[PDB]
Amino acid sequence: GSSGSSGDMPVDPNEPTYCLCHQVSYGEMIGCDNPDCSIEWFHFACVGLTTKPRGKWFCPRCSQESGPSSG
Ligand SMILES: [Zn+2]
Ligand SMILES: [Zn+2]
């Protein structure tokens, strides 16, 4: 069979992964505005988000793109 380590168990095919955490759906999450983004899902605590931002939101993995982005 298979033992169920009490301490800490590794990932599982139970559910698909989205956020970099490489974990299943959990906690507060958001949807990346970028239509190209494959994940389009990240955890708040991870995306330094305290509340649900109104309008559009771009993950910290897309916005940081090498382009004409000047400031
Ligand atoms: Zn995460
Ligand atoms: Zn994104």
PDB file of C-alpha atoms and ligand atoms in Angstrom:
ATOM      1  CA  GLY A   1       0.000   0.000   0.000  1.00  0.00           C
ATOM      2  CA  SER A   2       1.111   3.536   0.819  1.00  0.00           C
ATOM      3  CA  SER A   3       1.715   5.292   4.140  1.00  0.00           C
ATOM      4  CA  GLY A   4       0.324   8.760   4.775  1.00  0.00           C
ATOM      5  CA  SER A   5       3.238  10.683   6.267  1.00  0.00           C
ATOM      6  CA  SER A   6       1.782  12.859   9.027  1.00  0.00           C
ATOM      7  CA  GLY A   7       4.563  15.433   9.119  1.00  0.00           C
ATOM      8  CA  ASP A   8       4.432  16.723   5.551  1.00  0.00           C
ATOM      9  CA  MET A   9       3.328  15.076   2.305  1.00  0.00           C
ATOM     10  CA  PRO A  10       4.518  15.988  -1.217  1.00  0.00           C
ATOM     11  CA  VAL A  11       2.324  17.355  -4.006  1.00  0.00           C
ATOM     12  CA  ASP A  12      -0.368  15.202  -5.609  1.00  0.00           C
ATOM     13  CA  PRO A  13      -2.380  14.881  -8.851  1.00  0.00           C
ATOM     14  CA  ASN A  14      -5.462  15.640  -6.756  1.00  0.00           C
ATOM     15  CA  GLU A  15      -5.782  19.064  -8.381  1.00  0.00           C
ATOM     16  CA  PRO A  16      -3.960  21.127 -11.041  1.00  0.00           C
ATOM     17  CA  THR A  17      -1.318  23.690 -10.085  1.00  0.00           C
ATOM     18  CA  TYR A  18      -1.430  27.382 -10.991  1.00  0.00           C
ATOM     19  CA  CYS A  19       0.572  29.768  -8.808  1.00  0.00           C
ATOM     20  CA  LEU A  20       4.354  29.393  -8.650  1.00  0.00           C
ATOM     21  CA  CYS A  21       3.838  27.670  -5.299  1.00  0.00           C
ATOM     22  CA  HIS A  22       3.069  24.659  -7.496  1.00  0.00           C
ATOM     23  CA  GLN A  23       0.030  23.847  -5.358  1.00  0.00           C
ATOM     24  CA  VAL A  24      -3.657  23.185  -6.018  1.00  0.00           C
ATOM     25  CA  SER A  25      -6.397  25.816  -5.840  1.00  0.00           C
ATOM     26  CA  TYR A  26      -6.620  27.410  -2.393  1.00  0.00           C
ATOM     27  CA  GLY A  27      -6.884  30.712  -0.551  1.00  0.00           C
ATOM     28  CA  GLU A  28      -7.796  33.960  -2.293  1.00  0.00           C
ATOM     29  CA  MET A  29      -6.740  34.066  -5.945  1.00  0.00           C
ATOM     30  CA  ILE A  30      -7.035  36.375  -8.953  1.00  0.00           C
ATOM     31  CA  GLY A  31      -7.081  36.236 -12.741  1.00  0.00           C
ATOM     32  CA  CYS A  32      -4.317  37.748 -14.860  1.00  0.00           C
ATOM     33  CA  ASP A  33      -5.628  40.246 -17.410  1.00  0.00           C
ATOM     34  CA  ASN A  34      -2.992  39.166 -19.932  1.00  0.00           C
ATOM     35  CA  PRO A  35      -4.745  36.892 -22.462  1.00  0.00           C
ATOM     36  CA  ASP A  36      -1.417  35.209 -23.216  1.00  0.00           C
ATOM     37  CA  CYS A  37      -0.732  34.195 -19.615  1.00  0.00           C
ATOM     38  CA  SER A  38      -1.066  30.417 -19.325  1.00  0.00           C
ATOM     39  CA  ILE A  39      -1.584  30.259 -15.561  1.00  0.00           C
ATOM     40  CA  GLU A  40      -3.779  33.320 -15.030  1.00  0.00           C
ATOM     41  CA  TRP A  41      -4.086  32.408 -11.350  1.00  0.00           C
ATOM     42  CA  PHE A  42      -2.047  33.339  -8.277  1.00  0.00           C
ATOM     43  CA  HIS A  43      -2.493  33.353  -4.498  1.00  0.00           C
ATOM     44  CA  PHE A  44      -3.001  36.698  -2.760  1.00  0.00           C
ATOM     45  CA  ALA A  45      -0.450  36.253   0.027  1.00  0.00           C
ATOM     46  CA  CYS A  46       1.888  35.371  -2.841  1.00  0.00           C
ATOM     47  CA  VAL A  47       1.007  38.271  -5.138  1.00  0.00           C
ATOM     48  CA  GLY A  48       1.398  40.656  -2.217  1.00  0.00           C
ATOM     49  CA  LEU A  49      -2.336  41.304  -2.451  1.00  0.00           C
ATOM     50  CA  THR A  50      -4.325  42.174   0.671  1.00  0.00           C
ATOM     51  CA  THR A  51      -7.642  42.550  -1.152  1.00  0.00           C
ATOM     52  CA  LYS A  52      -9.263  41.881  -4.527  1.00  0.00           C
ATOM     53  CA  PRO A  53      -8.126  44.640  -6.924  1.00  0.00           C
ATOM     54  CA  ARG A  54     -10.898  46.151  -9.044  1.00  0.00           C
ATOM     55  CA  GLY A  55     -10.497  46.267 -12.814  1.00  0.00           C
ATOM     56  CA  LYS A  56      -7.562  44.435 -14.379  1.00  0.00           C
ATOM     57  CA  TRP A  57      -4.519  42.848 -12.741  1.00  0.00           C
ATOM     58  CA  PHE A  58      -1.285  41.552 -14.267  1.00  0.00           C
ATOM     59  CA  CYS A  59       0.702  38.873 -12.438  1.00  0.00           C
ATOM     60  CA  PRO A  60       4.248  39.766 -11.309  1.00  0.00           C
ATOM     61  CA  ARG A  61       5.453  37.329 -13.968  1.00  0.00           C
ATOM     62  CA  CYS A  62       3.929  39.082 -16.980  1.00  0.00           C
ATOM     63  CA  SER A  63       4.218  42.792 -16.189  1.00  0.00           C
ATOM     64  CA  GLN A  64       7.960  42.255 -15.777  1.00  0.00           C
ATOM     65  CA  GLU A  65       8.433  41.848 -19.529  1.00  0.00           C
ATOM     66  CA  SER A  66      11.452  43.050 -21.508  1.00  0.00           C
ATOM     67  CA  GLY A  67      10.058  45.732 -23.797  1.00  0.00           C
ATOM     68  CA  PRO A  68       9.548  49.473 -24.375  1.00  0.00           C
ATOM     69  CA  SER A  69       8.191  49.647 -20.826  1.00  0.00           C
ATOM     70  CA  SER A  70       9.737  52.973 -19.817  1.00  0.00           C
ATOM     71  CA  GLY A  71       9.270  55.074 -16.696  1.00  0.00           C
TER      72      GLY A  71
HETATM   73 ZN    ZN B   1       1.182  30.892  -4.381  1.00  0.00          ZN
HETATM   74 ZN    ZN B   2       0.116  36.762 -16.022  1.00  0.00          ZN
END
